[PDB]
A paper describes a structure:
Type III secretion systems (T3SSs) are membrane-embedded nanomachines that export dedicated proteins from the bacterial cytoplasm. FliD and FliC are found in complex with their dedicated chaperones FliT and FliS, respectively, in the cytoplasm. Here we report the structures of the ternary complexes among the FliD and FliC flagellar proteins, their cognate chaperones FliT and FliS, and the export gate protein FlhAC. FlhAC folds in a clamp-like structure with four discrete subdomains (d1 through d4).
The structure of the FlhAC−FliS−FliCC ternary complex was determined by X-ray crystallography at a resolution of 2.6 Å. All contacts within the ternary complex are formed between FliS and FlhAC, with FliC making no direct interaction with FlhAC. Two distinct binding interfaces mediate complex formation. The most significant appears to be the juxtaposition of the FliS N-terminal helix (α1) with the FlhAC hydrophobic cleft located between the d1 and d2 domains. The binding interface buries a total surface of 680 Å2. In addition, a hydrogen bond is formed between the hydroxyl group of FliS Tyr10 and FlhAC Asp456. Amino acid substitutions that perturbed the binding interface decreased the ternary complex stability, with FliS residue Tyr10 and several FlhA residues in the binding cleft being essential for complex formation. FliS−FliC and FliS−FliCC (where FliCC is a construct consisting of residues 454–495) have the same affinity for FlhA indicating that the first 156 residues of FliC do not contribute to FlhA binding.
Numbering used by the authors:
A (entry chain B): 6 to 128, 160 to 198
B (entry chain A): 360 to 615, 623 to 690
Write the structure that this text describes.
């Protein structure tokens, strides 16, 4: 019953997802985990906070960063890889120091990239400029950014979100 | 009319329009694809029409023109479903999930993660209808397997098993008998993926057996290990319900009134299977198995009736409930 809605919510969306839509689910899945880890930390549940951050780190590392293609991507892939390494390093500090603003800036940097990715459908201060450069590359270079990021397998997206 | 149809209000058109967002349209095609993967045949399409007589956010699932399910689905809102152990209070539209009977509430997208903090299963609007459709096509998996679904499936196995299909149809087994047997498997939640064994078993017993129900029992015991795994994966503890050794000597004799008494005790046994987490499986003698399966599952469709000959011998078996 309860697991039926949770299973269909992910499986029915992954099986019909294009290579571009598989990346959208990783951004949306990582965003909800960061908000969960933020709300858990605001209440005091450090255990649940650590569980939510581990899911967010797993989506960014083994999903978004794992789907990066160096050769076909070029500058877009490496710029996202450095930007993804900053998020993982900041979320590890957010779980070890119980820092809430560290989750918020990663939540903000991910949204700065995901908003540009949702509009490209196929047919501290230094990290912000790194995301702005990636945001401009995604909007101005569509196909090369799809070759850079949209390379994940539906089998991997399911296990990361399930 | 339409074997599988769906009528939606005008508010649900963007979810079923390929030119717009169309989230619900893509989910139906995923459920149909997993249907074709799990059960073993391609089900008929879900023809989607718009009905302005319905409420804006109202949908209706049709089958042969007969309504089998309906409910509400608000696009911009999320459905936070309560498993029964979630705390806190959410603002929104209190309701009940259409596919089942759990308490749920339609909330704004901003409270999506907040609802998950309090222990709610939050799904989008297109998922609410997709889950309701997936829950319904599984119950009617046998009715979705017509003669054309059996003919195309026979042409598929003809390309992969020409040596078996050549002499089997239509000489040994007719398409009517072949469709009757395969539908009997689907009627009791056993897939027909292993077409190697099904056609092979028919090539062994059909020259000496013409009754499709007798062929179904023989094909089912050949798929015995597959049926054992779909209810007992790995080498777990087989936890089934059993009949009293006395009661077997009552039903066997009737085979060779107080049926309401049987119905009452069978329902109790299913309730105590929910404790310890055991499947609603009814293990019984091979002679009683086909009779009380077509009898108990009329009012208890969730009950699964098994036989001693199809349950794997080399496994940890143990009775849990008792009807007697």
């Amino acid at each position: 019953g309860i697991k039926a809605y949770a299973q269909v919510s992910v499986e029915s969306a992954v099986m019909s997802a294009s290579p571009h839509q598989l990346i959208e689910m990783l951004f949306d899945g990582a965003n909800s985990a960061l908000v969960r880890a933020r709300l858990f930390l605001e209440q005091g549940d450090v255990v649940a906070k650590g569980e939510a951050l581990s899911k967010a780190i797993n989506i960014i590392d083994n999903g978004l960063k794992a789907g990066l293609d160096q050769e076909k991507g070029g500058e877009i892939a490496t710029n996202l890889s450095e930007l993804y390494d900053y998020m993982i390093r900041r979320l590890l500090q957010a779980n070890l120091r119980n820092d809430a603003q560290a989750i918020e800036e990663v939540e903000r940097l991910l949204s700065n990239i995901a908003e540009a990715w949702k509009q490209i459908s196929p047919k501290s201060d230094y990290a912000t400029e790194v995301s702005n450069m990636s945001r401009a590359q995604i909007l101005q270079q569509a196909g090369t950014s799809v070759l850079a990021q949209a390379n994940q397998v539906p089998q991997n997206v399911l296990s990361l979100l399930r | 009319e339409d074997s599988l149809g769906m009528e939606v209000g005008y508010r649900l058109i963007p979810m079923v329009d390929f030119q717009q967002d169309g989230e619900l349209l893509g989910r139906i095609r995923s459920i149909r694809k997993k249907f074709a993967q799990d059960m073993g045949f391609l089900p008929p399409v879900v023809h989607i029409r718009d009905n302005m007589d319905l409420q804006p956010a109202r949908y209706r699932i049709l089958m042969k023109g007969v309504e089998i399910g309906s409910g509400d689905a608000y696009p911009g809102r999320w459905l936070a479903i309560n498993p029964g152990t979630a705390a806190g209070t959410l603002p929104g539209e209190k309701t009940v999930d259409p596919a089942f009977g759990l308490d749920a509430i339609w909330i704004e997208s901003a409270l999506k993660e907040q609802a998950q903090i309090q222990g709610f299963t939050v799904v989008e609007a297109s998922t609410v209808v997709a889950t309701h459709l997936n829950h319904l096509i599984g119950q009617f998996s046998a009715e979705l397997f017509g003669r054309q679904e059996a003919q195309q499936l026979l042409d598929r196995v003809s390309q992969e098993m020409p040596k078996l299909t050549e002499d089997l149809v239509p000489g040994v087994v007719t398409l009517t008998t072949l469709h009757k047997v395969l539908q009997n498997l689907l009627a009791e939640k056993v897939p027909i993926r292993d077409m190697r064994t099904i056609l092979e078993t028919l090539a062994e017993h059909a020259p000496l057996q013409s009754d499709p129900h007798e062929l179904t029992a023989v094909v089912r015991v050949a798929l015995g290990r597959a049926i054992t795994q779909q209810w007992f994966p790995g080498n777990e503890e087989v936890q089934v319900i059993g009949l009293d050794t006395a009661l077997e000597r009552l039903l066997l004799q009737a085979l060779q009134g107080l049926a309401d008494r049987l119905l009452a005790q069978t329902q109790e046994a299913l309730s105590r299977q929910e404790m310890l987490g055991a499947p609603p499986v009814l293990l019984v003698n091979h002679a009683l198995r086909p009779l009380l399966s077509r009898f108990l599952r009329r009012s208890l469709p969730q009950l699964v009736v098994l036989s001693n000959l199809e349950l794997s011998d080399n496994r940890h078996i143990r009775m849990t409930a008792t009807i007697g």
